[PDB]
Amino acid sequence: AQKRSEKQYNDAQNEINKWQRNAQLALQKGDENLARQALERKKTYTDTSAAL
């Protein structure tokens, strides 16, 4: 169970990294919505990670 929990936590971290790259892309593309979505996703994931 601990290993499974760790894997889930690891997956969340990986997702956050992908989101960060997307946020950088949004700045280059000048799209407000893409940047906003990534930030929101990072926050919920962080909360989820803390719970985990």
Partner: peptide, 11 residues
Amino acid sequence: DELAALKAQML
């Protein structure tokens, strides 16, 4: 968040 985005927008 919007305020933070504005700073990001310049870049």
